[PDB]
Design a protein around this ligand. Structure first.
Ligand code: CDL
Ligand code: CDL
Ligand code: PC1
Ligand code: PC1
Ligand code: PTY
Ligand code: HEC
Ligand code: HEC
Ligand code: HEM
Ligand code: HEM
Ligand code: HEM
Ligand code: HEM
Ligand code: DCQ
Lengths: 383, 244, 56, 85, 244, 383
């Protein structure tokens, strides 16, 4: 017996990265998983490096970031790499989740990797939120203020919880130092859950674009998907390069280069672009607590896809109506994103409400209806 | 929002540093420092820039040491623990005009002139906003505009009323390189210098990016060849089925 | 005039209200107010509007 | 070298009958006093030399070294210290 | 090393706070503050202690506010950005006698009197070292000792020559509680107060530890019972072997 | 099939903590592994908490630790818990290693968990060294200076490496901020290796005090070792309580309550007690590079125990001469510890050299001789 199979440690690596049996027809949308692993590795390397030069104390934080940009050798690179990779991480995660929804990756027998995936997504949001506060510019402070005040809506105890989270009566030094510590930790938690969702997946193996079994025709992960992953790694690195070297601040907000000032409120407080759709959903509901519930529900409702999809077939490759509904759902999610950063003005207020209703009605009405009807069309159509 | 509440959007000017492969014009940087020093430094600090930062960008080691040595900085206390001053060194930061915000506001009818070290990155528009703002004070505010006391009309500034008056007029500076110091020229130079102050890695960053683009592109091309090479047995596979 | 005092990081608006300002405030029928309150409930001294200057 | 329940890797077992009683049927502290005194004495007696010999030797060595070091840094030990350095 | 290089080891005095279940004597703490204030504070700071720290330990809220309000502290600049002083508040730290190290050393023939906030934890011996040192200046140095200039002989101090002279003499303080202020009494009180300053959680810590000891001990006893209960089927197992 | 066996995630937990088949006769020395897991959990909880209130900047570090002691609710507890558990971690790890050496846990088929164990031990040393610097008291600074200067002995590049590690020309702010970041990271690396050594162990299972196979007679890990582990957990917590609540500074150095001063050198710069034997070994060799090699070799020589132990029998329970040699080896290791903190004076200089020779001669001469002879005595003696 080969050492890679005999030795228990080597065999665990072997089972994931070498002998792992994969469908022979994964398309390029199966490459986001390895891009996400790459973002996670870049964020760990750059993040740990920034932590060697960053100071979490509110009197020094913003200046320690300027020291990184100005005095630390390649500090500008490490900082911009870290900041831009946070955006790339969300592009890859939206792509990966979109792949999963289009190809029915959430259906049995892959409910568990999908459900753990939904938690990975929440951990990414919290990680990135806390990391953004660490700069302690105007957007850092005011973003922390507004998002942490949503907790005040929790009945009875909400206010007490907010003061507890802040470690004081407003966002200040105690908040910044605790966000540093948690921002350092959360990526490690996230890596554990990323590992858990893969181990859970390994019981069924990867799904594939046709939605059928691949047990009939398997290909080793290496060398086929190793070398296929390199193409997208280099495509990603080219995009990374164009932002980090040629346009390092395109994805950011200029106000975050102004030091936090609790007195002056910035003209407009918007979240980082990747949180914008959830912010639009929150604005749609007039009630504070209503809005928070809606915003959270918008993520937790992903957990019911295994139930509301009534199809006897996995995935959308062969379902023209489901494909059109998916197209509308995705475009609506991008419209919500856009509406998250417009001013609260007519006519965007009502549009945001319509888009929010469409978002939820996909899960609760349209997908159950369309999936039921297509079942009947497949059966009658092929008689 | 009203367009006035937003501010007029600045034109896109063709800066020398626009362009994937373009550095700053260092002669313009040098001239822009001289505008900072002789006009802006009256009200605005540049606290993130040390004398050493100018060396080999705009000035030689000796010129920058001369600028430092003309100033006095706080030394460590003497042996009786009394305060002392020393002449500046290259490690010292360029000192600001005011001791604190309160003093700054008192000298500027309540308005606080921001530090200019990050201003090119801290405003939408960057260099174009700085150039547009400095050169965009109309002789007369548009009919109907009511300016608050101590405000000046400038359309590029959001709301229109800015607490900074026009400061650049033809020949307020005499450039040491003989360049005609028009309003436009000085605004261009100082906007360039401030852009440098906000992002001093600019020139090196873009050259390293050129190297990255080339290497990464080559690796992308080779990765495509290698993937196709390794996958060809799978792509080329053929079957004959004889039903049992 | 209205002052802004930092108090626990939050701004405090302190306005030294004139007589006619107080009058202007005491006009609005309490009935038509999202949060129904009269100035008398808010201030303990009509000449000193003291509020936490964070928008609700 | 280890399997799992049902195939642990034991040579075939045959001919052993094993018996035991429920934890609720038993006195957990049965014979505790005898164990605490006689069993502990036996176990300790049989291991005592393996502790006593090395501990006593290394304690004696340390004692001699620390006493000499103390003495060398007194007035009385001036001359012996001078030679030692 | 010679014993002189080490310093004489202090006696173990029976402090009230010695004892797993013993708090500080707060009356002694209060008296020790008064020794700090009237003797030590001339040369030594207590920078880690704020006025609020005394409240409900040694003094009432009112007494401590009175101490704070007698001093002047740096305020934020006024509206013209000029420096201002304010009266002290409970949040203020107790202010030190000197502005910097250089001033401190100049007043003490080159020696720097350490801050006393951590001194009870920063020296082997703790309270016993402080008490031994303050009360252990002999009238005459042992015959043969040559003291460096500005040094005083004290055997507890390593090397023997300390730059602090004897300061406690009978009746340098008049205690407000009528206690006879002997050298020994003042040294005991101030050593207690400084021990409190180094470890102000002392009283609460030891009481929570009593609760922990009791709970953890009970849980240890119960864990033994439960382990024996669950293990008894394994311990009691018997075999009959009949060779096949 | 039971869910704990059927579900792949649950089954991994199940295989380690519930159905795991254990020897029925493990004695109390098998309880240090779970105590080490407890120390690691305490250190993670307290360490992450301290990170919420600590400032890594050299101007603020020492004072942030005073702020923790004085102002943070239960800060004194969290700080002393963290500081004392660092010592308990080393008591448990020496006990665990001693158990392993006495019972032959390093022999085939358990060479791999033992070898990974040696690396865990090195990671613990580095973790604890860096954490001690973070206080930035006198011992913190001067300890960092002398230990980091040992790297200067690396030929040719040694000085350059030291300046690189420091991020400057002496221990200062850059060094403190990098040690904070690495101290935060190292415990996570350590937890991964702790997991790896357990997975490696699971192929043979635990050894046992008799040194024979337990495949004949296995007990589930739960409830038997779960409840047996509770006894030592409560014994540990009682010891923890006595230090943390009644004597929180007994294991420390008073000099670490003086703020770091690069000018004044402390009377004696000694490591934390748990590093003292290695320091004595270093002092024994007159050469700088010699001393560093010896110090490292003293740890790496543990890797050759599987080779130099020539016994046909696993462990010392039935080997009276090996038991006596083990007794002398352990007492010598404690003597080295004591000599690590005496002054470099007669007669401790020569004694330290003799003890160092004995330390190495155990591995290289005595154990190979004694184990060979006992093999022959077992054979002739039982004929
Ligand atoms: C971020 C970091 C950068 C890294 C890059 C990763 C992106 C790679 C990826 O997943 O997309 C490439 C991906 C190529 O992947 P593939 O493995 O050739 O085919 C996947 C589908 O089956 C391809 O579907 P198909 O075979 O039915 O072909 C459709 C495709 C043609 O696909 C191509 O080959 C292009 O063209 C379109 O759908 C265009 C839409 C028409 C608009 C007018 O391109 C697309 O599929 C784009 C269509 C998405 C809408
Ligand atoms: C630190 C954190 C606190 C947590 C505490 C955990 C420590 C527990 C542990 O591993 O030791 C208990 C352990 C009792 O464990 P055990 O599972 O009953 O027997 C383990 C021995 O292999 C059984 O050894 P044995 O049956 O041959 O009994 C020997 C033992 C008698 O052991 C008895 O407890 C009786 O007495 C001695 O060897 C004393 C030496 C004579 C001095 C005079 O105490 C010892 O036997 C210490 C002997 C070391 C020399
Ligand atoms: C914008 C809207 C996109 C609609 C896509 C409709 C299908 C299509 O034409 O795609 C081409 C292809 C069609 O591929 P296919 O696998 O259905 O068909 C391959 C060819 N046949 C049918 C012969 C087998 O679709 C994909 O590859 C879809 C991947 C979805 C990724 C979406 C990311 C959005 C992020 C939002 C997150 C929340
Ligand atoms: C101090 C010197 C220790 C000597 C030990 C000799 C054996 C003995 O008497 O121990 C009792 C017992 C004897 O147990 P045993 O398993 O050999 O025998 C049980 C009884 N019979 C033989 C009847 C089955 O030994 C242990 O339990 C030894 C564990 C060693 C742990 C050492 C920690 C030191 C840390 C240094 C790290 C480097
Ligand atoms: C962490 C972030 C990862 C992203 C890396 C992309 C570019 C970063 C490289 C830095 C850089 O600017 O290098 C340039 C060349 O780029 C290049 O040629 C680098 C692109 C290579 C892409 C990835 C190839 C492997 C990189 C990751 C492996 C790291 C660990 C493995 C041992 C020019 O810089 P320069 O040429 O002046 O540099 C001195 C040597 N002359
Ligand atoms: C004597 C006063 C004075 C001089 C001279 C001065 N400024 Fe200003 N400047 C101000 C004040 C006051 C503000 C704040 C205006 C406000 O916020 O209303 C300001 C604001 C600015 C802003 C930011 C406007 C914004 O978007 O917030 C920039 C950029 C600026 N100045 C650049 C310059 C440059 C470049 C020069 C000269 C070469 C210059 N200033 C000369 C007083 C001055
Ligand atoms: C007028 C000067 C002066 C007064 C009064 C004074 N000290 Fe000091 N003290 C010093 C100087 C100077 C040193 C440093 C001595 C040295 O390092 O040589 C010092 C050192 C100490 C030390 C540390 C010695 C060591 O181990 O490093 C303690 C403890 C101490 N003083 C406590 C007190 C207490 C308690 C009082 C009064 C109740 C007091 N001092 C009064 C000047 C003074
Ligand atoms: C999933 C992984 C991570 C994500 C998505 C993430 C995201 C972010 C984001 C969005 C910021 C704000 C960046 C900016 O605009 O300047 C940031 C800052 C920071 N992150 Fe992370 N991060 C991650 C991992 C880490 C890790 C593991 C560390 C280790 C400490 C870390 C340390 C930092 C530090 C010190 C900063 C502040 C300095 C700065 O702004 O550049 N991050 N992070
Ligand atoms: C750090 C973030 C993540 C990483 C590194 C990651 C990584 C991966 C990898 C390597 C795979 C197998 C290859 C592939 O299909 O692309 C995969 C599959 C999967 N992931 Fe993720 N993932 C992450 C986040 C998520 C999230 C947020 C979800 C769900 C909301 C998710 C759900 C899934 C599912 C369902 C699969 C199996 C899909 C299939 O093969 O059909 N993942 N992931
Ligand atoms: C964080 C440090 C460590 C943890 C948490 C840990 C934990 C454990 C645990 C739970 C076990 C199984 C139960 C037991 O025998 O006690 C074990 C076994 C073992 N550990 Fe460790 N360990 C650590 C460090 C080490 C070190 C430093 C070594 C070696 C130098 C080591 C070598 C072993 C060996 C050889 C075994 C198998 C012993 C046997 O059952 O016969 N471990 N460890
Ligand atoms: C194996 C785990 C760990 C060990 C052995 C360890 C050891 C130490 C030690 C010895 C100190 C010096 C303590 C003192 O005397 O005050 C310390 C300080 C510190 N450690 Fe850790 N540590 C561990 C895990 C962690 C973790 C996970 C964090 C997370 C950040 C952390 C954060 C800190 C901080 C902030 C300090 C400085 C504050 C202080 O001195 O208490 N530690 N650690
Ligand atoms: C994060 C990695 C830490 C690894 C340790 C966690 C496991 C907890 C200890 C449990 C344990 C195991 C696994 C074990 O295998 C064992 O049998 C030898 C023990 O008791 C005698 C144990 O106590």
């Amino acid at each position: 017996m080969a050492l890679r199979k005999k030795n228990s440690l080597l065999n665990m690596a072997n089972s994931y990265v070498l002998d792992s049996p994969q469908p022979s027809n994964l398309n390029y949308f199966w490459n986001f998983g390895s891009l996400l692993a790459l973002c996670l590795v870049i964020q760990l390397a750059t993040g740990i490096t920034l932590a060697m030069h960053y100071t979490s104390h509110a009197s020094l934080a913003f200046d320690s970031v300027e020291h990184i940009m100005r005095d630390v050798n390649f500090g500008w690179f490490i900082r911009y790499a870290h900041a831009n990779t946070a955006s790339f991480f969300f592009i890859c995660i939206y792509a990966h989740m979109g792949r999963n929804i289009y190809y029915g990756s959430y259906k049995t027998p892959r409910v568990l990797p999908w459900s753990i995936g939904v938690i990975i997504f929440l951990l990414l949001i919290i990680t990135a939120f806390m990391g953004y506060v660490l700069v302690f510019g105007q957007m850092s402070l005011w973003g922390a203020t507004v998002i942490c005040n949503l907790v005040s809506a929790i009945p009875w105890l909400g206010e007490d919880i907010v003061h507890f989270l802040w470690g004081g009566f407003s966002v200040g030094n105690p908040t910044l130092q605790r966000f540093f510590a948690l921002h350092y930790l959360m990526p490690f938690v996230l890596a554990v859950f990323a590992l858990l969702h893969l181990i859970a997946l390994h019981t069924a193996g990867s799904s594939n674009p046709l939605g059928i079994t691949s047990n009939v025709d398997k290909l080793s992960m290496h060398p086929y998907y190793s070398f296929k992953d390199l193409i997208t790694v280099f495509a990603f690195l080219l995009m990374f390069t164009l932002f980090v070297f040629f346009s390092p601040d395109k994805l950011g907000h200029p106000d975050n280069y102004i030091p936090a000032n609790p007195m002056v409120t910035p003209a407009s407080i918007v979240p980082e672009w990747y949180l914008l759709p959830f912010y639009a959903i929150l604005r749609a509901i007039p009630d504070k607590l209503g809005g928070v519930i809606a915003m959270v529900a918008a993520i937790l409702i992903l957990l019911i896809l295994p139930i509301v999809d009534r199809s006897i077939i996995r995935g959308n490759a062969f379902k023209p109506i489901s494909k059109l509904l998916f197209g509308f759902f995705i475009c609506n999610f991008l419209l919500l994103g856009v509406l998250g950063q417009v001013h609260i003005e007519p006519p965007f207020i009502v549009l945001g409400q319509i888009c929010t209703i469409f978002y939820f009605s996909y899960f609760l009405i349209l997908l159950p209806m369309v999936s039921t009807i297509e079942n009947i069309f497949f059966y009658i159509g092929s008689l | 929002m009203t367009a006035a509440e937003h501010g007029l959007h600045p034109a896109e000017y063709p800066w020398p540093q626009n362009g994937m492969l373009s550095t700053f014009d260092h002669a313009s940087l040098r001239r822009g420092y001289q505008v900072y020093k002789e006009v802006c430094a009256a009200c605005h600090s540049l606290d993130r820039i040390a004398w050493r930062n100018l060396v080999g960008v705009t000035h030689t080691t000796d010129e920058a040491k001369a600028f430092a040595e003309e100033l006095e900085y706080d030394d460590e206390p003497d042996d009786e623990g009394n305060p002392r001053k020393r002449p500046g060194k290259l490690a010292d930061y360029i000192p600001g005009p005011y001791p604190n915000e309160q003093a700054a506001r008192a000298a500027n009818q309540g308005a606080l002139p921001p530090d200019l070290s990050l201003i090119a990155k801290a405003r939408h528009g960057g260099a174009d906003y700085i150039f547009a703002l400095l050169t965009g004070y109309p002789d007369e505010p548009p009919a109907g505009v009511v300016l608050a006391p101590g405000m000046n009309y400038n359309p590029y500034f959001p709301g229109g009323g800015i607490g900074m008056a026009r400061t650049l007029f033809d020949g307020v500076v005499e450039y040491e390189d003989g360049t005609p110091a028009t309003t436009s020229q000085m605004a261009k130079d100082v906007a360039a210098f401030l852009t440098w102050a906000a992002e001093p890695e600019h020139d090196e960053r873009k050259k390293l990016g050129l190297k990255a683009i080339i290497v990464i592109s080559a690796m992308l091309g080779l990765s495509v060849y290698i993937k196709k090479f390794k996958w060809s047995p799978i792509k080329n596979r053929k079957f004959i089925y004889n039903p049992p | 005039k209205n002052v802004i005092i930092k108090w626990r990081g939050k701004p405090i608006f302190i306005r030294h209200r004139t007589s006619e300002e107080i009058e202007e405030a005491n006009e609005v029928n309490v009935a038509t107010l999202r949060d129904p309150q009269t100035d008398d409930e808010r201030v303990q001294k009509p000449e000193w509007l003291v509020m936490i200057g964070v928008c609700t | 070298y280890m399997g799992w329940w049902g195939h642990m890797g034991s040579p075939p077992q045959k001919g052993i009958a094993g018996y035991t009683i429920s934890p609720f049927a038993a006195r957990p502290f049965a014979g505790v006093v005898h164990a605490a005194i006689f069993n502990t004495f036996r176990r300790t007696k049989n291991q005592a030399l393996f502790v006593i010999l090395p501990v006593s030797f290394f304690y004696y060595v340390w004692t001699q070294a620390s006493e000499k070091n103390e003495w060398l840094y007194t007035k009385a030990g001036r001359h012996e210290l001078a030679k030692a350095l």
